[PDB]
């Protein structure tokens, strides 16, 4: 979210 993990874009 950058909080929760996810791809950057």
């Amino acid at each position: 979210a950058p909080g929760s993990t996810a791809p950057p874009a």
Partner: antibody
């Protein structure tokens, strides 16, 4: 310790639905998203979508929106993928796997689906 | 959708020698905020689950032998096995982790030269 235990092989007729399970143990289920991946002979690997049971976030590959449904039962630490209107194109090995590529990457043993009349 | 391309489709390798495998992305996988390439390499052997070898293009996953090395940046990536062993004869897939939908290359299968 960590395991993702998938349900047994499925053999079904064209047009049927199937629901595959992926039971997590050895860690806290809500801590990691479960992604689903299709391994079909001569079609490498394909990402289907994920369910994040901690925040109930679900995302699909556009190709599978309308075809696949991802659910999760927090009480039994189990993720589910349902596939509908099955064709021989759906015959494949389906894997559940934990998290993103990185330190938490971990895979189930796979479930074979055969669709045939 | 990011298109991942791998060549060659298969490769006859001499056991004990170095092998290099290529992967190309249709879009840059380099994220300017953290300077990381969101590219992973997986191994798969028949009847087994995929195993993560490399992520962030060059970070070796836990329990992966040192003969495996990832390099490259942007759109052009390489997986190297120094001194390939018989147990390394398998299919190698790159995967971009940069944006949804996650997409994989079509794989490079390593077979043994004789």
């Amino acid at each position: 310790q960590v395991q993702l235990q998938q349900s047994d092989a499925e053999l079904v007729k064209p047009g049927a639905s199937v629901k595959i399970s992926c039971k997590a143990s050895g860690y806290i289920f809500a801590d990691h998203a479960i992604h689903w991946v299709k391994r079909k002979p001569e079609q490498g690997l394909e990402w289907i979508g994920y369910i994040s049971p901690g925040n109930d976030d679900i995302k699909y590959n556009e190709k599978f929106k309308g075809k696949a449904t991802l659910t999760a039962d927090k009480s039994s630490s189990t993720a589910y993928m349902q596939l509908n209107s099955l064709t021989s194109e759906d015959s494949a090995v389906y894997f559940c796997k934990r998290s993103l590529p990185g330190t938490f990457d971990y895979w189930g043993q796979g479930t074979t689906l055969t669709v045939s009349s | 959708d990011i298109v991942m391309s791998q060549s060659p489709s298969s490769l006859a390798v001499s056991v004990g020698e170095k092998v290099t495998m290529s992967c190309k992305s249709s879009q840059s996988l380099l994220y300017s905020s953290d300077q990381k390439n969101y590219l992973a390499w997986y191994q798969q052997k028949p009847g087994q689950s995929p195993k993560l070898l490399i992520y962030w293009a060059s970070t070796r996953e836990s329990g992966v032998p040192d003969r495996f090395t990832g390099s490259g940046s942007g759109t052009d990536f390489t997986l190297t096995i120094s001194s390939v062993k018989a147990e390394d004869l398998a299919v190698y897939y790159c995967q971009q982790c940069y944006s949804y939908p996650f997409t994989f290359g079509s794989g490079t299968k390593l077979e043994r030269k004789r």
